Design a binder for these strands. Sequence first.
RNA 1: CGGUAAUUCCAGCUCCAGUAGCGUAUAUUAAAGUUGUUGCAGUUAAAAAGCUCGUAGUUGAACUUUGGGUCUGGUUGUCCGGUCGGUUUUUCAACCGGAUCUUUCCUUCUGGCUAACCUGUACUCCUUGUGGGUGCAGGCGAACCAGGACUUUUACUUUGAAAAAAUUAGAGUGUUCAAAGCAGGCGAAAGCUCGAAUAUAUUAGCAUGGAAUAAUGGAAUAGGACGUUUGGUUCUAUUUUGUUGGUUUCUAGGACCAUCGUAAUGAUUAAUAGGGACGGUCGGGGGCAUCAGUAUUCAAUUGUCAGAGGUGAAAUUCUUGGAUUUAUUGAAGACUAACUACUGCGAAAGCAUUUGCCAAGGACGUUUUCAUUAAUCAAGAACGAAAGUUAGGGGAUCGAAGAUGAUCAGAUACCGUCGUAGUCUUAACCAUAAACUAUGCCGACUAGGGAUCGGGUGGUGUUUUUCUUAUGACCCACUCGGCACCUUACGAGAAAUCAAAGUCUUUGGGUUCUGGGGGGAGUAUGGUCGCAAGGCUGAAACUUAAAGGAAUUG
RNA 2: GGAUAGUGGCCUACCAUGGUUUCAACGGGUAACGGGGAAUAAGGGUUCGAUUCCGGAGAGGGAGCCUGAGAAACGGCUACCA
Lengths: 155, 129, 82, 150, 145
Amino acid sequence: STELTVQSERAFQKQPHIFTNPKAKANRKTKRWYKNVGLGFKTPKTAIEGSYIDKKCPFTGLVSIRGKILTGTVVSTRMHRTIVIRRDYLHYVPKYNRYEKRHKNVPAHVSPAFRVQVGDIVTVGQCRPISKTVRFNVLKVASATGKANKQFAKF
Amino acid sequence: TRTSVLADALNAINNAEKTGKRQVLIRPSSKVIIKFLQVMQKHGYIGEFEYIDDHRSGKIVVQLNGRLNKCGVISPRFNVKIADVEKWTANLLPARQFGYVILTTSAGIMDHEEAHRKHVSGKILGFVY
Amino acid sequence: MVLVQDLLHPTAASEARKHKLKTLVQSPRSHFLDVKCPGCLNITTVFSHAQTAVTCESCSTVLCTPTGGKAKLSEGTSFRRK
Amino acid sequence: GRMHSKGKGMSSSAIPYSRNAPAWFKGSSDGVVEQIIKYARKGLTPSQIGVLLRDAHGVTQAKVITGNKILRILKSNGLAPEIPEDLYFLIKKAVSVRKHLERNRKDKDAKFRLILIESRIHRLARYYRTVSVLPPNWKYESATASALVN
Amino acid sequence: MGKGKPRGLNSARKLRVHRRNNRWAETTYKKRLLGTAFKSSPFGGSSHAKGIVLEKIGIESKQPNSAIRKCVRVQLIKNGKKVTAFVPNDGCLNFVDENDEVLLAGFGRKGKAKGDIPGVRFKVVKVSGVSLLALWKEKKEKPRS
RNA sequence: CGGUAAUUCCAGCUCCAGUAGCGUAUAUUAAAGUUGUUGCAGUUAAAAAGCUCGUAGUUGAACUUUGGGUCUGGUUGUCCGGUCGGUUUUUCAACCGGAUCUUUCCUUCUGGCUAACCUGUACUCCUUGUGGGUGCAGGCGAACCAGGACUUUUACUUUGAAAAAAUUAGAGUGUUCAAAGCAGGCGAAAGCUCGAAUAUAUUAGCAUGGAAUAAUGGAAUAGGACGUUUGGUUCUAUUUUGUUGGUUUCUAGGACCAUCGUAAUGAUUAAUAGGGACGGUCGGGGGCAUCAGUAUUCAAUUGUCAGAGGUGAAAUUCUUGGAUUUAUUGAAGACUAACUACUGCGAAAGCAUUUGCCAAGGACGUUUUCAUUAAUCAAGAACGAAAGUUAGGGGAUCGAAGAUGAUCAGAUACCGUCGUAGUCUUAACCAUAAACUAUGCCGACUAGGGAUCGGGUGGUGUUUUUCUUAUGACCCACUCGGCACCUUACGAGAAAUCAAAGUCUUUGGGUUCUGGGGGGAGUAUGGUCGCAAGGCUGAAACUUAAAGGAAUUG
RNA sequence: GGAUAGUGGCCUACCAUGGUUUCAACGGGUAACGGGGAAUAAGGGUUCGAUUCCGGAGAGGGAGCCUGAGAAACGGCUACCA
Ligand SMILES: [Mg+2]
Ligand SMILES: [Mg+2]
Ligand SMILES: [Mg+2]
Ligand SMILES: [Mg+2]
Ligand SMILES: [Mg+2]
Ligand SMILES: [Mg+2]
Ligand SMILES: [Mg+2]
Ligand SMILES: [Mg+2]
Ligand SMILES: [Mg+2]
Ligand SMILES: [Mg+2]
Ligand SMILES: [Mg+2]
Ligand SMILES: [Mg+2]
Ligand SMILES: [Mg+2]
Ligand SMILES: [Mg+2]
Ligand SMILES: [Mg+2]
Ligand SMILES: [Mg+2]
Ligand SMILES: [Mg+2]
Ligand SMILES: [Mg+2]
Ligand SMILES: [Mg+2]
Ligand SMILES: [Mg+2]
Ligand SMILES: [Mg+2]
Ligand SMILES: [Mg+2]
Ligand SMILES: [Mg+2]
Ligand SMILES: [Mg+2]
Ligand SMILES: [Mg+2]
Ligand SMILES: [Mg+2]
Ligand SMILES: [Mg+2]
Ligand SMILES: [Zn+2]
């Protein structure tokens, strides 16, 4: 979400230490470097076919996914390239021997490879500290459509 | 609403057995009910029981034996961690000696003695003593 | 009705007596009465609890005035059972 | 025991033993299906239809004879309305009380009821939205509800 | 009956918030949670209090019984508050004397009046560093004046 | 407890308890099921919001793979000790697995190792043999990898890995005993030698099995599933063409629209759940509109000459220039009797003269339709008696205030007489009542009796009688819905009592709320709401041994 | 970009309007250092944990820094307050 412009800051952003040789004359021009992420996660072609740079993407960046591979649905999407994943869970309380439905929203960076909307479930890997709160990175929008192509009643 | 059918059924049983009716009717009638009853049959708290098919929902006729005392149900199906069985059965049944705690589990719906042999616990449903 | 009733096989008196809902099996006690109007020689399968001013197949004869329970069959009319 | 009042009835249709047909009551699956889709173009609702099918003609249930229910027939021919049948009948009644209140400023027990019917609708809508019949972020009420009717 | 309280396997919070907010009618728990002991209760929520005998009072008791009780108004040292302490045993306010440091104790009742002494919640123990019982019985002797 | 025999004060002797300790004070845990998850109460003892709606919450009907065989591993009791108090099988057992076969896949392949013989290539080392194996082209893959492809996801539970030590429990051991400690033990007593465990800690994460339970999900515009599809479309792209830069192939892997087929092509119920449609009904339900009775009042005209009102026993108080009484009206704004009940409807509050209109509603019936929409609910709302309040209209009588006449030691109190505010209404508010069934809502199930009513069935029943009638109205039996009694309680309950206040120490169907000795106090404060009155919300300090409830006898 | 050993709203510029919340955000209180544990002791629990171990803080306050691998040290220093 934003989006599209590729090169549109005061600066002009390249994938650092990666080159698009002017002497050489390939069809792509831009050598789109990309990362195989591991942990059984497939590299989505929207990253490798696409345009955007992003430092903070796992695929098109130096961001290395590790550690806790959390999940949960997506509540908030409004900000630039990040998401807020709502990781619901229970909390056991022995003096009762029952459960609290607890909440914690997890802010998590989006590589624009994926299309993320509200009410979508999403696996998401811990990585470097991206930002203040965002220590996490969208890796797999599981509800890619979630009845998006199909509403639609009248035969 | 009619919530725990199992309970709502076992309640009728417990009322029937209290007065000494030789049978009872049980409206809703589930798997759990029938696997719960089946258990009572395997130990012998319960006679025949005859699952009517309303071309529909369920319905059961139990034959009581004059052997049930209480046909318990514990209500929020508490998860039980194998050792904690001992604390349930201790607190629900009269005596280490005899009684059963009907618990659903991985294995299906056992009683608490069968579940100890198997070494497999889970949630509780009810009990009988 | 006290202690031992053997509840799978009621006497049909009870089944007929008890609510059409409150038996061993919910079986309705309505029928599709095959009414013949005085006009045309053709038989309409009139459900006994119609809820509607039931006309014939085409001609506007008016067969059954829908009352609360079973419908009063309009005027001197004749019918078969089910 | 009813949604809104404290009256606990079982005014009910029973449904007979046979999922199968009552054979002798004849016609056909296709003939009845064609019978239905005339009434779907005449504007009549599944609930009205099935009365007409049952009362005059030899149908017991469309479920029985066709296999499909009725709304499910109508949908298959594209004749089910945008706003569902049941909801529509409440949205009508809502309007028929919102209209009566606009005239009668002082009339409390109708205001009471209007608060019920409104709530009944938002029960049903909130149901239907979650099914994915009506599109979500769409509230079914009062000002625009008069337009949703007609 | 459902028996009032909720019973869900996921209730918990509506138990644990309920039991926070009923406890508050348990007078044991309220004093502990609101520091009445510290903020009030002349002694600072403390076993005892040294306090200077401001005057030897005779307090006429409540009914059934009838006796003037021989007490001492004190000025608690630390707080500067003034209280009224009972002086146990035959006379023995004689042994207390006037303008002495007097160590006090609760009477027993966790505040409140011990029996018939209306508005006295304390017993003298040590008068200027002895012990009234040691004086009264005369096993020990007072350190002169 | 203590007023001259005080078993409680104070002293001697006895004596009790504990004992090198025991008392006292404050905490605190237990006792306290007096904080209650297990596990409390709420008709009256404290406690059910006046009522309904209602978001979060919490909870939520039933339904999808069951059963039978066939072998095969254990593990203790048995059958003798077959044995030098211990051990190894069988005659037997239950119990826990494992493999399978049953319309059945356990995730599937691209390849590595195909262990094995399903084999049969030479057929025989050889008791007359299907006892036995040197042995390799087709080839059973589970005997393991090592890489794809893509996993419905959870909760739940398993054993596992981890949860520092001391602590905690606990094994070993002569610190003399222990409390402990990690020591110790045995020789020729020239050297040797056991130990320093195990368990727990369950919250979260990680591991793996299990698939009941509970949720979640998939094909209903099939854009669905597969593949001998046959076209294609976009690829991507390594491997050889000497090696670089191409272009197009053959091809093997993506991905994407076509079209040809394959299969049983794909929706569970239709909850004595709910909603919604229809039907006839029912109602003192509500709004708005009219009609009455008839009533009281004043006034009119009318008539009749001493009192009429009032009285609680008794008085005061009023007119006579007929008040009152008698009769015709008029106005006004009221109410809306008798019927009227252990009757109706309404969420309650509340609602009875009439018709009319306005929408709503319960029950009912229903082989109608949707298919989880449902129950209860902190926030928020809607209504909400009377009084009060602003602002209007009216004011008959009663009638908070007041005057005033008696009585009594007195009495601004009854009674007495009058009588503003109101009462009544309309437009605003207020938002509480013994708004009380002092009984939260839903849910189920237990006992009969007879009735009672609003629905519905059957009676060649009876009578109506206009000839058969057919409605109506009963009788009688049973039924869904409503409102209450009788007896025993074997069930509850402290009991009164209660068929719910039962199905509760044999403690668990779901949910909301409230209470934790009495007072202080529904106060102080602070919010917040109100025109205000006041509401909602809501303290402690201090105080006190009882406050109650129910019943028993007096 | 700047800084840092390094990640980062850690800092700066320019841009966007997010972020948390009745599953109690924020605020207040704490006679609160956290945990191991302690007492109590059927089960469930309650209360306590300044205190022999493990973390974290502090060296009258609050700052700032030298040296040094390691200090925002205080049995180092600079200052201001007390
Ligand atoms: Mg019902
Ligand atoms: Mg409701
Ligand atoms: Mg006195
Ligand atoms: Mg306690
Ligand atoms: Mg209590
Ligand atoms: Mg009470
Ligand atoms: Mg279920
Ligand atoms: Mg020990
Ligand atoms: Mg008058
Ligand atoms: Mg009536
Ligand atoms: Mg009347
Ligand atoms: Mg509220
Ligand atoms: Mg009023
Ligand atoms: Mg007066
Ligand atoms: Mg009240
Ligand atoms: Mg009340
Ligand atoms: Mg109190
Ligand atoms: Mg940077
Ligand atoms: Mg502190
Ligand atoms: Mg602490
Ligand atoms: Mg500590
Ligand atoms: Mg301290
Ligand atoms: Mg330390
Ligand atoms: Mg100091
Ligand atoms: Mg410093
Ligand atoms: Mg130091
Ligand atoms: Mg120092
Ligand atoms: Zn015709």
